[PDB]
Design a protein around this ligand. Structure first.
Ligand SMILES: O=C(O)[C@@H](O)[C@@H](O)[C@H](O)[C@H](O)CO
Ligand SMILES: O=C(O)[C@@H](O)[C@@H](O)[C@H](O)[C@H](O)CO
Ligand SMILES: [Mg+2]
Ligand SMILES: [Mg+2]
Ligand SMILES: [Mg+2]
Lengths: 395, 386
């Protein structure tokens, strides 16, 4: 135990500080300190819009937290969620997520337990991950998939450039017919080359209409994909209906979701197989648990998004979540830079296509503030996409 | 072509906080847009100043739609209070430039005028029924056609203030307010009530039925609506008209409430829901089901929003009502505008643009001052919906 407060005594948040660092890329971290001595940290990173969350926390949320009882995780979650008045949203839920992660960090430290024990204990040993096999064309993407296979990955996401298709935001091009003609040939070549033992994933990256996604999903059926992800924009939760009606290719969505309200109909109408919402994107452990539980009712599984723009603090929480959650499906894993790992020392590790969470009380991650200050913030944007005629599209 | 040369964020507190975006061009003409998000103001300041504004530099400001789609889709993480306030500010400023370049007041570009004056409602508040009745009388005396009546409830009570709430106490008391209002003033005046997210769907249904004899103009925000099915039970059980949406920020928050015919008035605003570009889409969807606009309009939407809202209200075919809370004199001076109030109606002027501007020199004399919205808890301490 990090130290329990005496029975009948109070505990207060004394500080809620935002720390910004760029050890390879931008990360925002909230550190909640207490009068007991124990502290907790949470990820607040919102890629390409980082400083909006910094201000949300520093100027608005943090001053409200001071003096509050950090043990009251649920109450504080409801306070910042309901109390915002303007509810939901990428910036809002990142701030909430940062607070929630930091508070669960504190509770696990005080309990003298790794976080997964507080959530209900372990349901599995290792956490299956997928890696990112990218190529400019099919031949190259095929070779990249082989590399991940050699490395012992059980699951691989395969993405290829399409011939004829191409810090401020980089502008990229897109054409759907070109992709529809080419993408199924990638998966054909992959199965010809490697057979059917490995899980193969594809990210449609919001590019298709529902009918087009249905078309693509059908064309991919002979290749038995693990999932086709983010096939069509999903602000309208009815957008997956035609896709689900027409294909048995499994469907995943939700890396950009921030509350259960973004996913409730996709889940209850059985339009998806994997929910991709994350601890940082969707309001911390407190809220992600709700999302996972609703999904479980329909046998929908978790497939947490996990690019490098979710810091190791997020990964730590994600792995504790993954270790416990009964309807675990898979965990995305893109490796952070060495500098990032140094700034955020953590008790999780990778081995032969699986991540494993450690037994350190808390979520097992910390932040080296002295080292973090050596890497100053540097603006960086996500790309945008335009159609061939110049139409603004979904990158 | 024509280019954006700057997109600057201006912050001022002439009575309360306002955030404004000013888009300047290499053709001299500029436009302004409201970015104010009450109680979280500085988050939008950063969203704009640190992220969106640098992307705008060099873009063609004539391309309103393209820029909207750029900031909307390009964000990658879509929708949200902060996100859409930033988008709205850009959109208002670009429509301002377009109308200035056209030599026309903004309502002309939207489709021209559909009406003369804009019916408003004001806020008659009281600590109890007697006081609230007196206040409605005052608004009636001032020539208001429509009045929102809110009473404190006996037994129910900068950092956020913590207020109390008890549903049973309110269900027992609120209908009596409207009984007394109709007994005292008759049925000529439109009477409105804001449930302010306090009730479950069944409780809202119960309240709605109890309010039926009093013929309300609307019962607003009766139950939290993140779940768009939340209004189903209410609509099934009462003919009291329903309004919702001041806190919505995209059409995705309202599409089912509209298409399933669960509401009569959509309350989304120019600043809340992504500018003229997006609010037009919301109003048009609403029109298919005879749902009307009821734009939210408290003091925390700046005169820039009010200018845009009034241009919108002057054109939009399915207009219902416009909320109006008066800004301070200081605010009117900081934001020179061509709209005015007379005998229960607002009127937009004919100045090219949305008709609002900002005096930056004067704005600098009122520094930002942190202020929070209240929170509500139940009698047992449960965090609730203020
Ligand atoms: O599934 C994925 O990994 C991608 O969709 C993400 O890498 C996404 O593009 C980034 O997280 C955006 O910050
Ligand atoms: O309908 C209304 O006027 C109220 O709901 C608003 O005054 C609301 O409380 C504020 O706009 C919050 O900023
Ligand atoms: Mg993805
Ligand atoms: Mg209201
Ligand atoms: Mg009936």
């Amino acid at each position: 135990s990090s130290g329990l407060v005496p029975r009948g005594s109070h505990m207060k948040i004394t500080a809620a500080r935002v720390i910004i660092t760029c050890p390879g890329r931008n990360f925002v971290t909230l550190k909640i300190e207490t009068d007991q001595g124990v502290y907790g940290i949470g990820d607040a990173t919102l890629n390409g819009r980082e400083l909006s969350v910094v201000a949300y926390l520093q100027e608005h949320v943090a001053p409200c937290l001071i003096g509050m009882d950090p043990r009251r995780i649920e109450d504080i979650w409801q306070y910042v969620y309901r109390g915002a008045y303007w509810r939901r949203g990428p910036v809002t839920m990142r701030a909430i997520a940062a607070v929630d992660m930091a508070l669960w960090d504190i509770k696990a430290k005080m309990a003298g337990m790794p976080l997964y024990q507080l959530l209900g204990g372990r349901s599995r040993d290792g956490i299956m991950v997928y890696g990112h096999a990218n190529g400019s064309d099919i031949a190259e993407t095929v070779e990249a998939v082989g590399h991940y296979i050699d490395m012992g990955y059980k699951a691989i996401r395969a993405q290829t450039g399409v011939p004829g298709i191409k810090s401020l935001p980089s502008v990229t091009g897109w054409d759907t017919r070109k992709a529809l003609n080419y993408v199924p040939k990638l998966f054909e070549e992959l199965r010809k080359t490697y057979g059917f033992d490995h899980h193969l994933l594809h990210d449609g990256h919001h590019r298709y209409t529902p009918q087009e996604a249905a078309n693509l999903g059908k064309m991919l059926e002979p290749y038995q994909l693990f999932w086709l992800e983010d096939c069509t924009p999903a602000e309208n939760q009815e957008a997956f209906r035609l896709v689900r009606q027409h294909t048995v290719t499994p469907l995943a969505v939700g890396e950009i979701f921030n509350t259960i309200w973004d996913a409730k109909d996709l889940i209850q109408n059985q339009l998806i197989d994997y929910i991709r919402a994350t601890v940082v994107g969707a309001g911390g452990l407190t809220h992600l648990r709700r999302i996972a539980d609703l999904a479980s009712l329909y046998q929908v599984r978790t497939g947490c998004h996990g690019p490098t723009d979710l810091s190791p603090v997020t990964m730590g929480c994600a792995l504790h979540f993954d270790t416990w959650v009964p309807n675990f499906g898979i965990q995305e894993y893109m490796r952070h830079t060495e500098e990032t790992d140094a700034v955020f020392p953590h008790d999780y590790w990778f081995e032969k296509g699986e991540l494993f969470v450690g037994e350190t009380p808390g979520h097992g991650v910390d932040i080296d503030e002295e080292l973090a200050a050596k890497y100053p913030y540097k603006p960086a944007y996500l790309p945008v996409a335009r159609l061939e005629d110049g139409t603004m599209w979904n990158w």
